[PDB]
Design a binder for this molecule. Sequence first.
Ligand code: K
Ligand code: K
Ligand code: K
Ligand code: K
Ligand code: K
Ligand code: K
Ligand code: K
Ligand code: K
Ligand code: K
Ligand code: K
Ligand code: K
Ligand code: K
Ligand code: K
Ligand code: K
Ligand code: K
Ligand code: K
Ligand code: MG
Ligand code: MG
Ligand code: MG
Ligand code: MG
Ligand code: MG
Ligand code: MG
Ligand code: MG
Ligand code: MG
Ligand code: MG
Ligand code: MG
Ligand code: MG
Ligand code: MG
Ligand code: MG
Ligand code: MG
Ligand code: MG
Ligand code: MG
Ligand code: MG
Ligand code: MG
Ligand code: MG
Ligand code: MG
Ligand code: MG
Ligand code: MG
Ligand code: MG
Ligand code: MG
Ligand code: MG
Ligand code: MG
Ligand code: MG
Ligand code: MG
Ligand code: MG
Ligand code: MG
Ligand code: MG
Ligand code: MG
Ligand code: MG
Ligand code: MG
Ligand code: MG
Ligand code: MG
Ligand code: MG
Lengths: 121, 129, 139
Amino acid sequence: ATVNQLVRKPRARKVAKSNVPALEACPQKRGVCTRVYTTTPKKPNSALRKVCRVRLTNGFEVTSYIGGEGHNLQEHSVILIRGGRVKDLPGVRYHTVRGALDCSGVKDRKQARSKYGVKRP
Amino acid sequence: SMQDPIADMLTRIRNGQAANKAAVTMPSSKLKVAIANVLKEEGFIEDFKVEGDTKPELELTLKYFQGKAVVESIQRVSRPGLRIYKRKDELPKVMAGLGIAVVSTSKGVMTDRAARQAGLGGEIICYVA
Amino acid sequence: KADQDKMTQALVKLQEEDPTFHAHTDEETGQVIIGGMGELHLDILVDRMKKEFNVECNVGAPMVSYRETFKSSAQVQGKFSRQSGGRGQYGDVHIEFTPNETGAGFEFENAIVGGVVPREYIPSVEAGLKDAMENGVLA
RNA sequence: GUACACACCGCCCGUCACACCAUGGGAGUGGGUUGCAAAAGAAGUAGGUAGCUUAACCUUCGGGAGGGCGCUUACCACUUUGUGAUUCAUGACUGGGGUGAAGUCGUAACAAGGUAACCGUAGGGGAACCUGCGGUUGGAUCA
RNA sequence: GCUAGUAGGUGGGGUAACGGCUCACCUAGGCGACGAUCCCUAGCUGGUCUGAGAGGAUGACCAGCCACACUGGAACUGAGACACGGUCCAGACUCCUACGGGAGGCAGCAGUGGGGAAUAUUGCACAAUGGGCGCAAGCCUGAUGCAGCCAUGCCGCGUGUAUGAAGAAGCCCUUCGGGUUGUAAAGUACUUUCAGCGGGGAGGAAGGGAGUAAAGUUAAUACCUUUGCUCAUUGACGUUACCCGCAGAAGAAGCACCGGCUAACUCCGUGCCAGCAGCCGCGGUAAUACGGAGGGUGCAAGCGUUAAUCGGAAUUACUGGGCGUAAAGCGCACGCAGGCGGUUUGUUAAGUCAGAUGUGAAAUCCCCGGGCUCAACCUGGGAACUGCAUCUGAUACUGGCAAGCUUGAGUCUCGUAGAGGGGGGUAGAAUUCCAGGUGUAGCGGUGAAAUGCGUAGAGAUCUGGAGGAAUACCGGUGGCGAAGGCGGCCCCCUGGACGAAGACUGACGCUCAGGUGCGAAAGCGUGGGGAGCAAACAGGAUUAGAUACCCUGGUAGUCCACGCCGUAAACGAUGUCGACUUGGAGGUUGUGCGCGUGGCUUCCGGAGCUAACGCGUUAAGUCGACCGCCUGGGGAGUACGGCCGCA
RNA sequence: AAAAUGG
Ligand SMILES: [K+]
Ligand SMILES: [K+]
Ligand SMILES: [K+]
Ligand SMILES: [K+]
Ligand SMILES: [K+]
Ligand SMILES: [K+]
Ligand SMILES: [K+]
Ligand SMILES: [K+]
Ligand SMILES: [K+]
Ligand SMILES: [K+]
Ligand SMILES: [K+]
Ligand SMILES: [K+]
Ligand SMILES: [K+]
Ligand SMILES: [K+]
Ligand SMILES: [K+]
Ligand SMILES: [K+]
Ligand SMILES: [Mg+2]
Ligand SMILES: [Mg+2]
Ligand SMILES: [Mg+2]
Ligand SMILES: [Mg+2]
Ligand SMILES: [Mg+2]
Ligand SMILES: [Mg+2]
Ligand SMILES: [Mg+2]
Ligand SMILES: [Mg+2]
Ligand SMILES: [Mg+2]
Ligand SMILES: [Mg+2]
Ligand SMILES: [Mg+2]
Ligand SMILES: [Mg+2]
Ligand SMILES: [Mg+2]
Ligand SMILES: [Mg+2]
Ligand SMILES: [Mg+2]
Ligand SMILES: [Mg+2]
Ligand SMILES: [Mg+2]
Ligand SMILES: [Mg+2]
Ligand SMILES: [Mg+2]
Ligand SMILES: [Mg+2]
Ligand SMILES: [Mg+2]
Ligand SMILES: [Mg+2]
Ligand SMILES: [Mg+2]
Ligand SMILES: [Mg+2]
Ligand SMILES: [Mg+2]
Ligand SMILES: [Mg+2]
Ligand SMILES: [Mg+2]
Ligand SMILES: [Mg+2]
Ligand SMILES: [Mg+2]
Ligand SMILES: [Mg+2]
Ligand SMILES: [Mg+2]
Ligand SMILES: [Mg+2]
Ligand SMILES: [Mg+2]
Ligand SMILES: [Mg+2]
Ligand SMILES: [Mg+2]
Ligand SMILES: [Mg+2]
Ligand SMILES: [Mg+2]
């Protein structure tokens, strides 16, 4: 582009949208579980990945992934969610924070305990 | 149409050097002759000669060293579309001083070194390496 | 359903207010069941919802989760053939259904003889039955 | 030549069926903001003066000057009415889009893909498309 | 598009003051594509973060400025307010009431509830600095000085140090030989920061209050004032820093990670399950990728994760990118604003350049230092603040002004070639139809058929007539045109190009957003025309079906006039103008004297360029001027809105 | 002449 054209119309940047809109520029957001269920991953993966529909305090209802093996989350459970999408799960853009609020830490976990809210054995 | 005669001169030199031409002739002008003097004094061209009166023509004798053109790169800096003026402290250094920058000062056209010695800034006409 | 979300919150608060109050949504029926130590207890709670929580509600009898079982035994055939060009879909299985011991649930028997159904397809047959059994065969 | 590379038993298009998601339209419905045209007139300030009243000054000793109060006018907040604009939410139903899963119907393109393909336009047809007119080569063939 | 106190003027009034500030009158102005008006968002700055920089992002703490103080509004007092802890009115809330009426405003400090992922004590002292009042003493000060809580960050230090083979047990692994943990631990010899206990101990303190003295002042050795002199006296922090002594390694390490990216690998368990995951992917029975263990790697009172900004991203490219085929040249042209502009002299000094002067708060950043045991932290000086204004200079270049010149551009004189355009006329061939003659059973069509046509005489052949459309051959990588396009011959009207030799004008130019014109085919409107061809439609075939391809028919349309539409793979998928840079073989059209010299065009190819293919003096090489356009694939050139259209 | 298809 020529300088004269750039004077008339300057170089234009990009908006860049967030992959975690429901968080609304917050590290975590509290919400209540509206439905805890399992879902199948997209090809080429096969499993029954655990997810939960959650209505956030901000008023957004989103799906969150329940990481770790085993959870005590039922409908009407208050959980803290953080950013983090799941590749093979379509529409899950958030993760539940284990070991916070009503969410419990993973049992029999000896490695990466802080990531699953487990206290030092 | 023809709008930048200086860039044309620089092109003729460049295209001549690439075509291994002994000399390059062009329509003459006071500014062209001034730059030709600076090139000659800095040892980028062999000699220049202005001939004619009604329509003077400037012939520049190009110099090739070991079968290689002395002028490895000649580029216009300030141009009609975008004029470039520099203060004495901002004068450019071509090829870390190994090249020259033809600058038009209030005391005439000269190299960047000469202008920096005279404590004069001006319009950066071209870079000649 | 606007008050349903409020009802959730109301039940939460009610549970905090009274330990004996127990709120639990039966998964099978999909209906929330309110437990109390007395009729009057539950009545007061519901009245509280209507007023304090401003949640209009109407009590009802908890739905019952029923199941089905074949009362008779009969040998049957299931044939599925869908070939009209290129790769098709053929599958025939002769399965005998008999009333199992009450509480024994499903007792599938692979009595395939002559390897008519290849071993690889056998688990699928069983799995397909299981899924179909989970779905209602009567009601 | 090629859009094929477990390599034509390749690749691959659209309708239809089902599920899900975002979104457009939709008799309308509920909010936010706002334009215009009016109405309204608390308090305050300024202007005028039915009446009422008055420490300091003047005085012929009666009054006078001036002031205050009240009243009145102007300006103006709340508030009110009508009619528009804009924005957001929601709406029976409906349009197309995307994502599913070894569904159904064909086989349109890629080889000359078996009628070369494609572009614009028009008409027709369950669907991919087909046909006319003009255009392009980003088609093979030639012994 | 916007605006009636609106723009200006005049007079009057008003303010501390200028002013439509206000009013009356007069004039009709003012603003805006250099973005007005309107909509959305937002306190601004010194600075902060990131970045090599240019930029990008940001404006917490600190400092300056502005705005607000329950909401809406108004004034009073005063030097200053339209006033956080003033007044009045209205409103919503809370509270009191004898029901008549009252009262109040934490966006001062602390604190409470609520909201939230999440942010502290209803502390102490005016000892110091600063402020209000006072003669002063003093008093007031949630300013401020300090203390509390919090790993929130930053910085410094510690959790021991040497020795120690027994290469112990024990763990893991192993080819069962052994290896690794690992000198690691025991064992031995030391040190004790810090914590703890004890005991010393600064500095922040200046002043103020008593006297006492001299001087000044005065009538006065009065009083007062000033400066010395002397004596008691003022620390919230506070159990201060710091120093010293005592006992004893005692009291003090965790977090993440090891498939690649990425420094760090095995065993076991599980078996497309459970699970993992930033990306690529991993898991279906020999998982360094899941989970556990052993071992290692990295960091450390932290370590991870999430959110967020910049960077990497030359991925909006000013620095610093592209557009033949990857995304991207408007279908073509004219042209206003705008951008840019040959050559010469003089003039001016706008830009530009130089120097000077004022300013650009302090802090911060940077450099050189100083001070806390060091560091973080604090501080002196300097630098920088890249800017702006003004003055004095320089004048090359750019600009302005003036005069020129001819080389760009243009005019004229003459000739040439051309399917360039518009209008009118005409010729020959062929098809179809109509009438008649001759003649007799087929014709036509296909891969093969059939529909169809024919004894009501077809087809074939001959003669006459009617009508429409298109112009064989010439004919060509030929020509003409801005593009779209343009083809018999003749005339009429008309545009452009090129060449030769002179003259004339004197930069009169180039590009061009918006605007305007032209713009294949199809299509649309009105009125004509209609031979042939042919969407649609019909029948016959083909086929599993055949809404096709093939056959027999056939309407709109194709044609003309006028109007509309405004699009095509409108393509060289290559914007326009100018200059420059090896060659060869051709075509077409001028011109000079076989050899020159112009215009246009085709193929091939060198350097160079290109991702490659290719392009290659007709550039996609080398440069300059201006414009258009692109920023992953879908969604989508679609929706919505606007404009245009009869549709 | 006809000559479809193949998670
Ligand atoms: K997998
Ligand atoms: K819909
Ligand atoms: K609506
Ligand atoms: K086709
Ligand atoms: K078509
Ligand atoms: K005004
Ligand atoms: K006036
Ligand atoms: K800034
Ligand atoms: K306010
Ligand atoms: K005062
Ligand atoms: K004080
Ligand atoms: K650039
Ligand atoms: K112009
Ligand atoms: K000049
Ligand atoms: K017809
Ligand atoms: K252009
Ligand atoms: Mg809607
Ligand atoms: Mg009033
Ligand atoms: Mg096909
Ligand atoms: Mg085809
Ligand atoms: Mg093709
Ligand atoms: Mg058709
Ligand atoms: Mg704001
Ligand atoms: Mg950078
Ligand atoms: Mg006053
Ligand atoms: Mg006050
Ligand atoms: Mg207050
Ligand atoms: Mg507070
Ligand atoms: Mg809360
Ligand atoms: Mg007090
Ligand atoms: Mg490695
Ligand atoms: Mg294993
Ligand atoms: Mg990040
Ligand atoms: Mg960048
Ligand atoms: Mg690029
Ligand atoms: Mg393409
Ligand atoms: Mg392209
Ligand atoms: Mg073009
Ligand atoms: Mg033009
Ligand atoms: Mg100047
Ligand atoms: Mg400063
Ligand atoms: Mg000049
Ligand atoms: Mg002519
Ligand atoms: Mg031409
Ligand atoms: Mg047409
Ligand atoms: Mg017509
Ligand atoms: Mg026909
Ligand atoms: Mg036909
Ligand atoms: Mg187009
Ligand atoms: Mg064309
Ligand atoms: Mg194009
Ligand atoms: Mg070539
Ligand atoms: Mg459209």
